[PDB]
Design a binder for this molecule. Structure first.
Ligand SMILES: N=C(N)c1ccc2[nH]c(-c3cccc(-c4ccccc4)c3O)nc2c1
Ligand code: NA
Lengths: 250, 11, 36
């Protein structure tokens, strides 16, 4: 996260860390949506251009963290995966369209003051909050600059940008399964997710029922916090039927 | 940079 | 898990459940043309 600050303890109790077993490293961010399911970005698990194709056996999920490198004994839980589901039409060849994956944990995790799931939006909450100008929050342990790394979880609140502005900032083809967020060069405010934050959550707090909803998944951006550029996120509500389907099917 | 995590989580 | 989440979803033990606010959520609600 660039130009974001340290998170508070228990601020994003749904933040998950995808950890690789050997080498032991942070792979991506993810979020806890139930006691057995985690949602992340599919490019964190499968990205052929760079020979990335992880299986159940190569990842570990760490929930309840704050600190990036320490094993927070008695606070965090580490779960193993049972199955990984990548959206059938995830497009890695061209623009990372439908960059979403679900991971089923081996065993349910117990919630605590540090582990609690986020809500997935329903048509009406999506419709009322995903508006240009409304701010959302992104969290992660990713890089602090494009070109070090934080010791603690970082948070940044970014405004959602109008789609034409998003499209006119890149040469990549934007689809309706993506949205972009960030400040204009012109708003003398900065912030963006960056490398290491892919897969994590973009959430908004409903002013109707005070709950936090995960509207997006950190997907991509060109550089980190470059002026004139924005971060793109997968549109969770547009892929919600796929989500509902693998959950009640599996 | 990452501290060691308990062996029971590798197996 | 599904629509609107899970049931007790989105309410943080250390914040909403105790009626405590984190330091920047205000920024968010204020951008939804102000909330409350
Ligand atoms: N500026 C942004 N909004 C942004 C957000 C997420 C990113 N993630 C990355 C990223 C960069 C290199 C490799 C990966 C990656 C991670 C896992 C598997 C394959 C590639 C990234 O997620 N850059 C990113 C940039
Ligand atoms: Na920018």
């Amino acid at each position: 996260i660039v130009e974001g600050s340290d998170a508070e303890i228990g601020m994003s109790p749904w933040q998950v860390m995808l950890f690789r077993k050997s080498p032991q490293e942070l792979l991506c961010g993810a979020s806890l949506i139930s006691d057995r399911w985690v949602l992340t970005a599919a490019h964190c698990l499968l990205y052929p251009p760079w020979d990335k194709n992880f299986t159940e056996n190569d990842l570990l999920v760490r929930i309840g963290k704050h600190s990036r490198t320490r094993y927070e004994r008695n606070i965090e839980k580490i779960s193993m995966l049972e199955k990984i589901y990548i959206h059938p039409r995830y497009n890695w060849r061209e623009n990372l369209d439908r960059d979403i994956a679900l991971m089923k944990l081996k065993k349910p995790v117990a919630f605590s003051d540090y582990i609690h799931p986020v809500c997935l939006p329903d048509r009406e909450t999506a419709a009322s909050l995903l508006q240009a100008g409304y701010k959302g929050r992104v969290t992660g342990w990713g890089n602090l600059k494009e070109t070090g790394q934080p010791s603690v979880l970082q948070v940044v609140n970014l405004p959602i940008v109008e789609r034409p502005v998003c499209k006119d900032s890149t040469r990549i083809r934007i689809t309706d399964n993506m949205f972009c967020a960030g400040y204009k060069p012109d708003e003398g405010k900065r912030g963006d997710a960056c490398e290491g934050d892919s897969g994590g959550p973009f959430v908004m707090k409903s002013p109707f029922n005070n709950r936090w909803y995960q509207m997006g998944i950190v997907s991509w951006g060109e550089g980190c916090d470059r002026d004139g550029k924005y971060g793109f996120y997968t549109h969770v509500f547009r892929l919600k039927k796929w989500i509902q389907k693998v959950i009640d099917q599996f | 940079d990452f501290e060691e995590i308990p062996e029971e989580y590798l197996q | 898990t599904f629509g609107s989440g899970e049931a007790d979803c989105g309410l943080r033990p250390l914040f909403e459940k105790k009626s405590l606010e984190d330091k920047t959520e205000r920024e968010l609600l204020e951008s939804y043309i102000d909330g409350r």
